Amino acid sequence: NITIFTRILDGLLDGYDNRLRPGLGERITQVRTDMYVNSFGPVSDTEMEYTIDIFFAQTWKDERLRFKGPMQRLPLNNLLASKIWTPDTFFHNGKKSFAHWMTTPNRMLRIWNDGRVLYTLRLTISAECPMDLEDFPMDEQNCPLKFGSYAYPNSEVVYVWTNGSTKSVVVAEDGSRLNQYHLMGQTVGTENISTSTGEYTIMTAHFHLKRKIGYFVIQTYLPCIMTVILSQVSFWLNRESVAARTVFGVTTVLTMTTLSISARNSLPKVAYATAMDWFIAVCYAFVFSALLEFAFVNYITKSQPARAAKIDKMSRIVFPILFGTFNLVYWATYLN
Amino acid sequence: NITIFTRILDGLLDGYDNRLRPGLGERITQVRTDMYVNSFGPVSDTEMEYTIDIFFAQTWKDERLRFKGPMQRLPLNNLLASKIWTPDTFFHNGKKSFAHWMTTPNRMLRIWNDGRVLYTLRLTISAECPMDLEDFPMDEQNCPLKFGSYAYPNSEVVYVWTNGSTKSVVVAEDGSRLNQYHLMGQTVGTENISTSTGEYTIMTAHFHLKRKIGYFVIQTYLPCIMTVILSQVSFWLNRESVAARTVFGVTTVLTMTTLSISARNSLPKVAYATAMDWFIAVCYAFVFSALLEFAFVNYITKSQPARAAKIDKMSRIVFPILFGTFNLVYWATYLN
Amino acid sequence: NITIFTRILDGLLDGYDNRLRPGLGERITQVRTDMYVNSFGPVSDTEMEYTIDIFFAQTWKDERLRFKGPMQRLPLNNLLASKIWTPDTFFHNGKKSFAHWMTTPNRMLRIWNDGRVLYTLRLTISAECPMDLEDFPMDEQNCPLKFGSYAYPNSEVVYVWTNGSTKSVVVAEDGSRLNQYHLMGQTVGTENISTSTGEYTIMTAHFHLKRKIGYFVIQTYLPCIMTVILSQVSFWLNRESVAARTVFGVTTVLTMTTLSISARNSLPKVAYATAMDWFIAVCYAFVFSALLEFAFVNYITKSQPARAAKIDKMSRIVFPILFGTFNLVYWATYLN
Amino acid sequence: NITIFTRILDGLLDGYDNRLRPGLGERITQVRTDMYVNSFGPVSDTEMEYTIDIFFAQTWKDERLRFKGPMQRLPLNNLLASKIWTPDTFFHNGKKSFAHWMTTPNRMLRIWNDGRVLYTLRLTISAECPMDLEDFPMDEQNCPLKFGSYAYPNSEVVYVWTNGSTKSVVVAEDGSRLNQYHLMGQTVGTENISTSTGEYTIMTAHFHLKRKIGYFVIQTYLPCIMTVILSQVSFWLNRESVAARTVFGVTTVLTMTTLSISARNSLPKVAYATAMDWFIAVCYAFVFSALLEFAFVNYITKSQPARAAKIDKMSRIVFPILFGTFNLVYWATYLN
Amino acid sequence: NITIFTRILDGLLDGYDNRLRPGLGERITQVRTDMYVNSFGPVSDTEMEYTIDIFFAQTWKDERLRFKGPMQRLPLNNLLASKIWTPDTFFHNGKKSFAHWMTTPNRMLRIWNDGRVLYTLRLTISAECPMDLEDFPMDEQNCPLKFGSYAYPNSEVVYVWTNGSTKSVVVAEDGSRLNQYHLMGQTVGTENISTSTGEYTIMTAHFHLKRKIGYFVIQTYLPCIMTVILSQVSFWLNRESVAARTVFGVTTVLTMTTLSISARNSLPKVAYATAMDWFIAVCYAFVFSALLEFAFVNYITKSQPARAAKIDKMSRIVFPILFGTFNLVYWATYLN
Ligand SMILES: CCC[C@@H](CO)NC(=O)c1ccc(OCc2c(-c3ccc(C)nc3)noc2C)nc1
Ligand SMILES: CCC[C@@H](CO)NC(=O)c1ccc(OCc2c(-c3ccc(C)nc3)noc2C)nc1
């Protein structure tokens, strides 16, 4: 009984040219694309790339594959894929894309009586995501994903998303788990580009990323905040204890310097100032300013001791207030 | 005499279509899966992936391979594997799976008279293991391993473990050796998933991991514990030695700060607090608090020396008791 | 109707030898090359290599492919590419070049009635860019890209850019985005080389790179500048405070030493002095010189206190002026 | 004249089934294995793997290859290897094995009149070497290398070393050069294993490794030894110099702490104590104990100065003696 | 007209056995090898390997390829290479060699009427270069490159360099550019080796490398030299300033300790002392010795102040002289 299916396959392959698209010189081929993101890979700020794994699916029409039989569907595998025509889809921004092979090549091929074809493929894309780290770490990123035909212009092959946007792109709940980002949502789009070879249709999908704060708070912000508090303790000490107050100022200044170097080692080498850098610089001024205050006080502690005492007492109140006020402005500005 | 076997192989291949599963349109194919873990690979917390090497085996039925001969078994190699039908099994969570080739492709194919087939394969799977580092390092992890068909729905191919759970999955004694984890045990499971293409059967296996403590004790906990003890020595010193007591407080505070930075460099960049972080913070307060005590004492050592002496004497007893009490609560809470 | 195209393809392949170039022993083949840079990859100073992704296109003439039909163009794919003759172009300086495969091999093949052929290919080139870091970081680099034939001498195959230089090489606006470089412009060139096998034609394209400053200012220059200012504070302190002034000098000298080590860790291991190194050395002298001044002052503070006071007062003015003057000369020299 | 050899090859291939082993269902095939280690690769303690390059050779018997001709030997290449039957040998513990291809596949195939076959292959094996770092760095390791058949049980194929053990395994003098290990010698062995598929024969070869000390002496031991000596200098100083003696104790304690962290960064993350760790801990006690002695002395220098002087004088002698005695016990225990 | 060439190719392939070398059982094949180094890759001391890219060329004789035609040369490509016999050359010391593919396999095949064949190939070799770092960094290295036949003994195939040594090996001027080495020159050689399979001919080429100093001077030597000078400043200070002189000695000793650790991190883990290590040790003694001098002086400053002053004055002169004298001996010894 199974032999009937074998005859059908041979008939379709008879007089079949895999090098010619269906409806050549007669109409325009239409392709429907749907995507499912199995898991969203890590985002590397240093390399400006993000990995992703998807089940890419493409649907089109082919009159040459019409067949008649008891079954309306013919599940198959990659064996027959190489014997027919498939679109030459590729990713413009994909630096390096590799497929999955074991245990068996992850591909499917389904054919119906009307000729409709469903071809699906599993891929891993190491695309590139340009970013503007001006409000880092309070930054929102829009990592795109562009793909389209390579050799078939817009006058022969057209890519259109199937059904609505939500059905076109699906993201698994467990996949959207990044250590330092939130997957707020997804969007889709289309456009045309004109080149020497002709016009092409481009399908674009964007993923909205919102960085989650909390790692940098425990790593960079808190050490800077506590370092400033340490310096202010020198004010409460007596003036005559020159050595004691000197240690506080010198050690704190060096501590701030090394934090800036270590903090930016992980951050990408960007030739502009970030929000974190401004925060570090302000904290650097406080510790440095406190050291200057001690030097000025110790330089006039003999001629006019009266003014020195007033300055030292005043500093115990002025400096904490300014630091507290600055934090409210800084956090409010970037968090609202 | 050997020529008899050659004729048998040709007969089976005659009229054989590798693109059609056995019993198509007549019944539902059943596949029995058994696994053996040669060695459990390292677990990378930063990349949330774990490597594993297994001898994957699949058994099914094929009536087209029936044969009659003196021998009930026909040991073979990968040469005949490509000439017949095999399931398109794949791992849903496998980021990158590669097979082993040298010296000869590690595959076997055995056929019996009844048509039963035993196909085995050697694989290395770089799967992903999501984790919740809320009780780190006292954390228990459940790294899964999911696999199933790609193109054949649940109505055509069904995966069922053979015999009991213990026989289905076997782990070598030498393989279960990880530098920073314990392989407490294994479990298996099954479930169905409905998608656009149809329903599929999913076979799930979980490995229980219990982190072994002792590396972090020698790396993070002890330096923090000894640092606190160092600070308390300042209390036993005389008040007039302002410079001496200052060095203890300043150096210890900086030492704690760098330990936090270095400790989390190896730990994954997670935007939430761990148990280790709370322990570090508490130890940071003690050293910082001791420095504040000295400043307060030195600020009133002239007007009311009587109260200063009482505070210094009391601090020698209060602080050690609190630190000792805290450790009992902390360790007891997470170890019981 | 489509069957007409199938017959045409078979006719061209009849009596076609892919191992023989067109017009063998009759004339000289001419090839026109055009390039489009999709994205300019990162530049690794340590490895002296730069990555790049391009759409390489080659045009030539083949009389054997003449055909007559309703359509003047025959869009195709990589399937027919292997069945005809293509040039053996290669990159002389390309350390490791790999192509892109998924989803379908990124190649196109177009044929016209006259025999003109348009073959395009997508490549990623990890070429090598020698550099002279004598004015680092104020350095301008000229990273080339050389390619040509491997087996066909200049007497058989000649490479010539099509149209003008601007049309020959095109760089996408978004692609020319490097974290630490500016793509000032592009240039092209040609030349011949004589070897044992014979003369060959070499096509050379150069990319002008101008390093963008600002990362090193926040990383190396500022810490050195602030460190010098810290040392000068010791002058304003009193001579009798021997311990206080000692701490400033000792700590600052060590701080400068570690900055030099850390700064050059990222920089390539080059056995010659850079502009940054000279700046560090000068700053090292100031902090070291200040320490020497204190030692000299403290060594004569008993016999002739009168001269010691004059030296200390003078140092408060001389040193800042010299440091300010040096910066103007240094920055002006390399920035103009 | 050469045409005679061509006819011989065709005759052997006639009626040859590469899927059936020689003497099937008649006897048991016997295979002789010999190995030559071109170079022993680096040993990675962190990854518990060792690389090795060998010229694997296998000899067996095949009656179907009998031939008659003037020459008793037929040197050949990999071209004929794929056309005959070869054993499916594989390495059980080989995580990832890759062969060498350029310039030409490194394989040989020699056939004699009697049917004896000599098949050799070049391989690189990234095997795994479990270790017990309890006596680190004075540890001796036994890295094995296991290989055997995959599909052919012990009842069909048997592996036996040829000639004696010394001839079976050969190691080049230049190859046995490791930066931090000594190749004391080699050993071989055999055993059987019973599994579901049946019994198999396992050939095991062990390499004895003796770690060479001297890198850790210059890296970890000496800094700890010199640090202890530095602390003892504080004893010779006067009691009234509270600040001076404080610096020695505080700085040394911190120095020991960082050495422990840095030392174990290269060492694998093992959750148990090593010999080096105990040595560090003992040295940590000395520096810490010296600081405690100063605090105790300074705490009674007023009420009973007489006892303080005796303690300080005694400490100058007791501490050096204990440190010297400890080293003799420690080194003698692990070196003998 | 071109059809004549097509007929010639078919005639040569007729009755051609690619598995049999020319002149089998009649004479000894002779192969001429010439090399051109496009670029000399980086040398990794840690991994004891060096990368290199070459255009390997081999010339031999084949009577079966004789042809008659108007053209004395037949330029071709890799298409015909697989259809004839080529030597199985390989590199004995090549850990991992890979070829270049894009755009087209970099291979050429030229045939003359007499049968002479010119086969060339482009390769990248990651060979191993053992080194003896006893005089590091003033060390001269001899990195070899060995290659020869795999299956053809010395009685069948012999490798001989063509023309003189200079013509045999050619190095491009731009290629011989290493960041930390000088390519002084090249040499060639030959030898025979006897093994179980028989005698073989080995072709050896050595590259002379002379390390260029200047990176270590700016990285390791200068910080050590300046650190010693810093310690000597303590001598010029007054004895009563116990705290001041203590800081100089303690900080400098720790600074030297960390330089040794950091310096050897990049250096390979070798279990023996280098020249740099001895220089560091000597500098360590000076700073340590100066600290001992202060302790001895402060220990007798009460009983016999007269002798203390003489020691302090003398130390200001003795120590600088010894350090200067040592440098002359050290540099002269290794630089001459
Ligand atoms: C992600 C959007 C990228 C857009 C806008 O920035 N780039 C362009 O504007 C553009 C792209 C290609 C091009 O042609 C290069 C070429 C091709 C060729 C091949 C296949 C395809 C599909 N397109 C072109 N064949 O030869 C040559 C030479 N010219 C301009
Ligand atoms: C590890 C459990 C993962 C579960 C639950 O989280 N994911 C889903 O719920 C799910 C999976 C696939 C899917 O379809 C995508 C698809 C397929 C296709 C191909 C092969 C297979 C076997 N399944 C689907 N072909 O085209 C498209 C488009 N939709 C939803």
Ligand SMILES: CCC[C@@H](CO)NC(=O)c1ccc(OCc2c(-c3ccc(C)nc3)noc2C)nc1
């Ligand atoms: C980027 C410019 C590089 C220039 C200038 O520095 N190099 C040379 O001057 C040069 C290059 C090759 C050569 O021949 C080596 C050779 C070849 C062979 C193969 C294919 C081609 C295309 N050329 C040569 N076949 O065998 C052997 C031996 N000799 C000198």
Ligand SMILES: CCC[C@@H](CO)NC(=O)c1ccc(OCc2c(-c3ccc(C)nc3)noc2C)nc1
């Ligand atoms: C290095 C020594 C390792 C020893 C002792 O620790 N391991 C075992 O005891 C062991 C090994 C395999 C096994 O079977 C798994 C299997 C196989 C299969 C395939 C090929 C071969 C050659 N053996 C088994 N085919 O399907 C399944 C399922 N069971 C137990």
Ligand SMILES: CCC[C@@H](CO)NC(=O)c1ccc(OCc2c(-c3ccc(C)nc3)noc2C)nc1
């Ligand atoms: C770079 C110089 C290396 C020299 C000197 O140190 N080594 C030796 O002395 C030596 C090399 C091979 C050998 O044989 C191993 C072997 C081979 C085989 C295959 C192909 C070739 C060309 N040679 C041998 N086939 O099976 C087996 C077993 N024995 C000793």
Ligand SMILES: *[C@@H]1O[C@H](CO)[C@@H](O)[C@H](O)[C@H]1NC(C)=O
């Ligand atoms: C792209 O081209 C198609 C041609 O049919 C056209 O319908 C569509 O509107 C174009 N899109 C844009 C954004 O211009």
Ligand SMILES: *[C@@H]1O[C@H](CO)[C@@H](O)[C@H](O)[C@H]1NC(C)=O
């Ligand atoms: C999955 O589907 C099969 C269909 O036969 C059914 O027997 C089984 O109970 C289902 N499993 C679950 C968990 O629903």
Ligand SMILES: *[C@@H]1O[C@H](CO)[C@@H](O)[C@H](O)[C@H]1NC(C)=O
């Ligand atoms: C290279 O050779 C060609 C041969 O036609 C010649 O026309 C051209 O001028 C040569 N180029 C140079 C730079 O010599």
Ligand SMILES: *[C@@H]1O[C@H](CO)[C@@H](O)[C@H](O)[C@H]1NC(C)=O
């Ligand atoms: C392994 O099996 C073979 C079967 O012939 C037997 O001769 C041999 O003694 C066995 N080895 C061991 C260690 O039991």
Ligand SMILES: *[C@@H]1O[C@H](CO)[C@@H](O)[C@H](O)[C@H]1NC(C)=O
């Ligand atoms: C190597 O063998 C050949 C055999 O012809 C011989 O001529 C040559 O002298 C030998 N070389 C050495 C170094 O012995």
